[PDB]
Symmetry: C2
Amino acid sequence: VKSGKARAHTNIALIKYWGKADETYIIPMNNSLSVTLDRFYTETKVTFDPDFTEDCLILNGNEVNAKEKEKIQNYMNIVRDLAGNRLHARIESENYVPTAAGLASSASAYAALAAACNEALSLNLSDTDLSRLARRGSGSASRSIFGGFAEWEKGHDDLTSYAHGINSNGWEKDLSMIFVVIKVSARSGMSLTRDTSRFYQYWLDHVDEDLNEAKEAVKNQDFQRLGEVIEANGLRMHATNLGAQPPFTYLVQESYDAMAIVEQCRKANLPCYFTMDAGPNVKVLVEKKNKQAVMEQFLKVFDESKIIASDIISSGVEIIK
Amino acid sequence: GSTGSMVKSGKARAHTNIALIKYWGKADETYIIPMNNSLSVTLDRFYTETKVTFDPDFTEDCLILNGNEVNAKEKEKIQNYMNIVRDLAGNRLHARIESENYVPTAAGLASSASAYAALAAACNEALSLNLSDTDLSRLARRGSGSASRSIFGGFAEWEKGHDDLTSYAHGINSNGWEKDLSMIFVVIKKVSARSGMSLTRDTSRFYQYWLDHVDEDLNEAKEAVKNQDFQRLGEVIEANGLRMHATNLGAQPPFTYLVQESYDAMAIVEQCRKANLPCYFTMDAGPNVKVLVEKKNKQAVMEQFLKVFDESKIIASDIISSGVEIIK
Ligand SMILES: O=C(O)C[C@@](O)(CF)CCOP(=O)(O)OP(=O)(O)O
Ligand SMILES: O=C(O)C[C@@](O)(CF)CCOP(=O)(O)OP(=O)(O)O
């Protein structure tokens, strides 16, 4: 019997990953830039037993649905292949996330699993190969191998497509992300758009410049500059969905109300910037020093229970005991 | 009806139009000069009838809308517009304006294009200004940009120009193609069009993108019309309409006119399209989805929407060939 346990934190893309060059190995049309969150994470124990017939997944104490179970059994086949064994595993996982708030991620799930399998089967995988392993489950999991700022380099094959951590001289310790809590999966949404969106080329033509400008801002620890490019990049992502055949949107009116509050804060000498993912939740990057002030502005309009802050964590994926 | 010797009245009926290539954002806010050309179709079903009566006794302009007094705000608005008319006609006469909107305004359809075209034409008739169509378009434009196109029937294009003299629309001869087409309206506090286009135009991060493709879209559409190629016209206009709404997403801060139900209707259009009912949608300053379809398939497409939308919510109109007309 072989076993290991790890904690992986979710991460939010500032420069978005959106569209796969390759659906089976999960290679992206473009690089992406994320920050890892202190507050939301997944803890996953994996246990390999010669007696097991088929992989079992218990999440938060309950069993998973067809699609996940299947999704997990295909992923574990990849693990088996890599390990060179034929062992099925009982997986017990726990999401540390505000309940039923749309904030559970494949990113934390798969990074945690990859690192737990790594530990269980003693593979001593390099961070690079761990990221690659996580990428095969969910693209954004590639980045949750790392803390702080991370970049997923798209590469062109299974070997070259992986994330790496970015040193910002501890800039991440100065930043925070406020969540405003407010259904098409990212996988399905993004493939429709990657395949059919009339505005997809426009996305591809600007993503690299945004990326470079984002990465440059990080080197200089220049918040306003980072803020503006990621905000624009973010909106361009949702634009591409408007061009889809047929169009769709992740956003609802409340999402826009939150956006408007972010703009006012800037006008009130409280710099912050928003982004949205595959849902209407609005995420607000802000400096720690201004975090409380910005939150107060939201509390005027949103319920206290819906305004949830998190720090950016510096460390990466972590084996547990 | 009967009019005293020293009173000049005129009454006109102008039809609403829907932009297939969108006007969105002004170069000049005071004279209403657009940042780009637009192209539209004039709808047979929806129109405004406006009567105007000039009387030397009248001390100020009066506006009666669908039988009721307008408030002081809209009153003040209409008096400033009529000043333009007075300046043009070289008089100082005031008028009583009796207008009736036969447009589903409560349902969200815009009345601004027909209202201002009707008013312009009505005045030209009352005062005998002998205005050319070009000059009628220019006068309607001062009131609302889209109004410049409602002077004309069928397909019409607003040439943007660079000043008050050069910015106006004309009718496009389509060899009668307008007679084969129809538009279906799926009916679903609004930022005004004027207000909305201004925020996007001034601040939108994606506005340049709009500007970089509008002329190409327009040429493709116009070439589509010359060819009477419904697919070619439909694809470019659908994309154009979507790009306009995209710009709004890039505004500071963003907004949208679309709701989930709008998206639902679009889905049904694409469905009809995959099922050999060719049609294409567009949206203006609100959630209503408008569906361009050939008159033959109108009935079929409607039924598909009727599978999910309330019968009262689905309303078709043909496209009318004639332009603004004076009436009794
Ligand atoms: O995370 C980002 O960069 C952007 C998004 O969050 C925005 F919605 C997408 C997440 O993608 P994911 O769930 O990883 O897709 P998968 O590869 O199909 O599993
Ligand atoms: O009609 C189109 O080209 C597209 C739109 O309808 C989309 F919302 C804009 C209409 O603008 P309008 O009411 O004419 O503005 P005004 O000049 O400020 O009065």
